[PDB]
Design a protein around this nucleic acid. Structure first.
Ligand code: MVM
Ligand code: MG
Ligand code: MG
Ligand code: MG
Ligand code: MG
Ligand code: MG
Lengths: 103, 157, 187, 147
RNA sequence: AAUAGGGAACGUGAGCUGGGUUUAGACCGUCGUGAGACAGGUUAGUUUUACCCUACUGAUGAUGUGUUGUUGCCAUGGUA
RNA sequence: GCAGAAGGGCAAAAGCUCGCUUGAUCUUGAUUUUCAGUACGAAUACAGACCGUGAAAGCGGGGCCUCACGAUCCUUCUGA
RNA sequence: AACGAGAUUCCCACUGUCCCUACCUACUAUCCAGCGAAACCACAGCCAAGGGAACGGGCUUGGCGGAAUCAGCGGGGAAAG
RNA sequence: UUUAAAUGGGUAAGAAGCCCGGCUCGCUGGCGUGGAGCCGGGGUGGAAUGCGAGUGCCUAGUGGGCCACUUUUGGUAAGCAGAACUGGCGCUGCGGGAUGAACCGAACGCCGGGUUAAGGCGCCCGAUGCCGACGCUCAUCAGACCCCAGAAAAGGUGUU
RNA sequence: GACCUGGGUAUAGGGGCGAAAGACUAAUCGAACCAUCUAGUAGCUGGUUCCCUCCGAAGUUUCCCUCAGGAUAGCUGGCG
RNA sequence: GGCGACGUCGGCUACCCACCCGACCCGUCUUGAAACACGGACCAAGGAGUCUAACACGUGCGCGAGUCGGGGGCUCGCACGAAAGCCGCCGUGGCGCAAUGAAGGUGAAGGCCGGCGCGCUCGCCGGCCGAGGUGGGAUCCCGAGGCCUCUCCAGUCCGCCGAGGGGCACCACCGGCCCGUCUCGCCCGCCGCGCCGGGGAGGUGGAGCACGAGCGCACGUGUUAGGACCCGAAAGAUGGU
């Protein structure tokens, strides 16, 4: 059953897998569902911006990626203090606030 | 089954045949082998230290290495499905020169000086050797006497 | 009856190309008209390289070309290569060599034409030279693939150099007995 | 495509391409990699020497971010920049040398390889091999380390 | 008078009989720690179908001779 | 006679006595033997080290040679 | 001792167990009237010798062969289950 | 076991050679030594006969074999068990052996002509329906074509 | 008479029950039946559906708790 | 050149019959089948090498030191649209371009000239280049010489060209280089003189280098895992009547 020169194989099929299969025959039908969940949410609220609030500037935390810069989670909580805006008007101004963040 | 051993079918072929026992004659050591000298293998039985294998008692090879007491020889041992150029380290006693290349080396050397001898003589000498030709029409003589009649003898026990 | 052969009487080479490429079929019909009428060989070598498969027409790099044309005797000849010319970046300076090939890439044919070369295909070669006189015919490294380094004696016996198939080159993958004498044996 | 394959071609031949004698049954030699030690030994070896046993030290929870050093050797070093500069930084005036930093291209280490051309270079990388920097300090170039 | 030796799927079970062998019950002896074993022994133990073709034994017959009947001959085959 | 089973080998010897002695030591490869031309084992020539012997050339990395032995995992001990 | 649809041997009386079979009756079988299955089935069915997968029905060489059948019959079909 | 056959096995029958001339070397070392190495220069017809050869890839099927001369081992011996060389059936018809896996010929597209092979030529059955040639043999169980399907010791004034 | 018999009730699968035979437990018992896991595994038998054209073998080596099988080489084809 | 109708002339099909010769019944295991080896009464329809993943190799296509949008996003509220089109400061990411080592780690260029420090086998310097050499190697180039109605005057040519040159792919070899260990050895460097780094020359281990050839997609073949070509048990387990 092993024959001339080839690859040793470990396929993970000894476990019964014909019950836990997940066909994606609806992955178009979810994209046309979650554009309506945006288009009837982009006009639903306001001339407030879509694509969420203003997100911070964040540097990636590993030796692999610390040369590039990522959008993060929220202003740490002294940027609200240095720029001089109260911490619980900041999320209804439309700025995203991350409470537990260090600087 | 049949005891896959070294030195097995060699009651007769690793022994001095007769009246030739004792120490080896010392001309066997005063031989000069170079990288390329074609040699054959005939293993002696007094010098236990390098004798090749019973596959090689009588197979003619060619030197590729010379050492302080042995000679590396490459030979052709027939295996089942093919042959193999195999290389063997044989001691100096277990071989000897091969006289199978004398009657090429002399007949090229009387085809060099015999080529240029006919070159300044002006001919087409045909130095290439030919196989044994059929008997050209000879001519016999029955000088005086006449052929002796013979006939089969009668049966006796 | 006749003999006891095991048959090689059917030759096995290519005679018509297995690609349904209608443009290569307009270059077979050009050259096998010129192969049997040239009374020479350069067509009959080009005519069988248009038959060959995708593997046996390897991608000739640019820098193999401009090295084999710097020999004494190739100074203004027009290099012909059956196969694709891809540019290298390891060389810096490209002369104004003139080539003639199927499918030079987009970046290579910039770098040939900007330095003042000329590229061709095999239809403005015939008009220039039906004999194909004054050319060097090139081919890439057909044994350059990673397939050919799997091929050798067997990846187990002495002096292997055969790169045995593993699913990941790393530790505890084919490195325990068969590779070192402290565990098991060494090949 | 069921036309082109073999089970149309072999439809009518009784044993269907698996012998009258072995008569291919279900699993004659054990399922999968069965018997790599015993009866498929000659096939598990010669074709996979090294397959059986420990070889190294454990490193529990290795993180694939700290062995991260993508490597340029110098023959790919001029093609990180626009070629409009390496002709421009080769104008005979002075040592007008441009920076070429690999760490804004995705590389951390400059390995050695021969045949660098004759322009003066300064290279920002985190790691240099000692063959590589003497391939830069021989073209009148410098080697500025940074991280 | 003689109590000759033999063969025919060790002739012969849809001919029979079951006495022994050779299932399951049981007893004894010897062997085995034991379950049990024993060409050692004993007792108790379901024997299926022919209506198919052939062979055969009988029974009407059949062709050919114009229909039909009476009296006959005998090729052969059996054998005291 | 050569320790032992046979076969081969051996005479200022491979035997028998004598005198020293640790080469039965460290080390990397190549090759031979059964072979699929894998592995263990055994064996062969070498090479680098340290030595022994001999006055010396030399010989000596176990037994005169053909058999005397054993993977992964695990345990143990040693080595920079 | 008694007892036993227990096992074995002998004796008396008895008898178709037998020597050695014969006859008679009833219900079938048999035939007609009516109703009417299954078992099984490559093709089918005469024999001797030969060879053959060593014991055929079919091949070889011989012997030979008449329609369609009924009542039986248990040699064969290495019958059928 | 002194000797030692036949058959068999190895090698060789040229340019990949041969010769001359010169430089490296840590090897060897009385010695421009020895030996390898390299560079340049000189001359192609070197036994027969036949033929196009080389090299890489992937991999199905198979892993129950038997028979024949010849040489052999067990066995009293076998259509027996085990071998060696080569052929053959298996996978393969056809002609012949009456019939048959394997013998003797001979190998196959479909056909018309001609000829032979092994074999046969009383009639089944194509062909001696030849003025075939020479001798032997009579059985009250004649004999009658390799494998092959029935025989010996011994004996005869049966006959040459 | 340690007798036979109707209905009610109790005991349920490694469990019931047995004056003991591995009997009986819904024709099923040296472990009942019904459903699912499950289309359970099978080195083992049975089968495996169109035509032409080309090539066309193997029963041996080595190893295996191997001897009805597989691996490896051998032999084959296709591709170049 | 000849012969001839209202019933004749040719011609056969899945037609019947008669004759001669040939001919044992088919699937199957098997060294061996007609078997006294098994299955097969007949006929219709159903009825058995699939799909998914992974790999390997061959071929085909596109791009090519790179390739790939498979996942999201964009376009109006379109049937065929669950399609197609585009994104690129959507390339994150896969696989490849870089191997070796247990691991810390380290990580692939020599050549030619000249000048030199005892040119001392060690070594130092600038210059030109630049993938090393040997032997084969299709092809291409030079090619002495020849070849046309008369001999001397010249042109593009052609064909046969002896010899010679450059040499693709590849095959064998020699050298080099990178990494792991081992023997021998001397030198240098200073974010600071140390049980510090760096190097050398030999010999081996490596799935390496020596001007890269891969990715994507489709198809075939083969192997494995999945009920895995279809059919088949004695069992085993849970949960119940
Ligand atoms: O009835 C039968 C009977 C007889 C034969 C079969 N067979 N045999 N093979 C057969 C194939 C198909 C059909 N039936 C078949 C079946 C049953 N009995 C019987 N006889 C003897 C032994 C066994 C039994 Cl059961 C009884 C028992 C008591 C006496 N009265 C009769
Ligand atoms: Mg197949
Ligand atoms: Mg099979
Ligand atoms: Mg009468
Ligand atoms: Mg049959
Ligand atoms: Mg249960």
């Amino acid at each position: 059953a092993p024959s001339r020169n080839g690859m040793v194989l470990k396929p993970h099929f000894h476990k019964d897998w014909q019950r836990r299969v997940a066909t994606w025959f609806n992955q178009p039908a979810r994209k046309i569902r979650r554009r309506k969940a945006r288009q009837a949410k982009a006009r639903r609220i306001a001339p407030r911006p879509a694509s969420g609030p203003i997100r911070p500037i964040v540097r990636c935390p590993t030796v692999r990626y610390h040369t590039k810069v990522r959008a993060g989670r929220g202003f740490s909580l002294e940027e609200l203090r240095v720029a001089g805006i109260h911490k619980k008007v900041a999320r209804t101004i439309g700025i995203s606030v991350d409470p537990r963040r260090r600087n | 089954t049949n005891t896959k051993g070294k030195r097995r079918g060699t009651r007769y072929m690793f022994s001095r045949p007769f009246r030739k026992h004792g120490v080896v004659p010392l001309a066997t050591y005063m031989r000069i082998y170079k990288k390329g000298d074609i040699v054959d293998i005939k293993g002696m039985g007094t010098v236990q230290k390098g004798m090749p294998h019973k596959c090689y008692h009588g197979k003619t090879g060619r030197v590729y290495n010379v050492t302080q007491h042995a000679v590396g020889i490459v030979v052709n041992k027939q295996v089942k499905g093919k042959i193999l150029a195999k290389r063997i380290n044989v001691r100096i006693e277990h071989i000897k020169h091969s006289k199978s290349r004398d009657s090429f080396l002399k007949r090229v050397k009387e085809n060099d000086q015999k080529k240029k001898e006919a070159k300044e003589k002006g001919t087409w000498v045909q130095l290439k050797r030919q196989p044994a030709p059929p008997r050209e029409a000879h001519f016999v003589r029955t000088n005086g006497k006449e052929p002796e009649l013979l006939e089969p003898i009668p049966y006796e026990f | 009856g006749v003999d006891i052969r095991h048959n090689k009487d059917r030759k096995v080479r290519r005679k018509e190309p297995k690609s349904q490429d209608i443009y290569l079929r307009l270059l077979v019909k050009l050259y096998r008209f010129l192969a049997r009428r040239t009374n020479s060989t350069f067509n009959q070598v080009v005519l069988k390289r248009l038959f060959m498969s995708r593997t046996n027409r390897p991608p000739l790099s640019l820098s193999r070309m401009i090295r084999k044309m710097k020999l004494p005797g190739r100074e203004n000849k027009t290099a012909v290569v059956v196969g694709t010319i891809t540019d290298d970046v390891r060389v810096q300076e490209v002369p104004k060599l003139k080539v003639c090939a199927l499918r030079v890439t987009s970046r290579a044919r910039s770098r040939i034409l900007r330095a003042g070369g000329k590229i061709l295909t095999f239809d403005q070669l015939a008009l220039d030279s039906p004999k194909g006189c004054g050319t060097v015919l090139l081919s890439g490294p057909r044994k350059g693939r990673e397939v050919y380094r799997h091929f050798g004696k067997a990846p187990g016996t002495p002096h292997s150099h055969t790169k045995p198939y593993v699913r990941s080159k790393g530790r505890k993958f084919e490195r325990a007995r068969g590779r070192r004498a402290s565990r098991g044996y060494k090949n | 495509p069921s036309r082109l394959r073999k089970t149309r071609k072999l439809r009518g031949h009784v044993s269907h391409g698996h012998g009258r004698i072995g008569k291919h049954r279900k699993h004659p030699g054990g399922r999968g990699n069965a018997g790599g030690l015993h009866h498929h030994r000659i096939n598990f070896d010669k074709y996979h020497p090294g397959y059986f046993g420990k070889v190294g030290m454990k490193h529990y929870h290795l993180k694939r971010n700290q062995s991260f050093c993508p490597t340029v050797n110098l023959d790919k070093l001029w093609t990180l920049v626009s070629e409009q500069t390496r002709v421009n930084a080769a104008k005979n005036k002075t040592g007008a040398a441009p920076i070429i930093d690999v760490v804004r291209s995705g590389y951390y280490k400059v390995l050695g390889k021969g045949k660098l051309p004759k322009q003066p270079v300064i290279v920002k990388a985190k790691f240099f091999s000692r063959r590589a920097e003497e391939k830069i300090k021989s073209v009148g170039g410098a080697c500025v380390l940074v991280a």
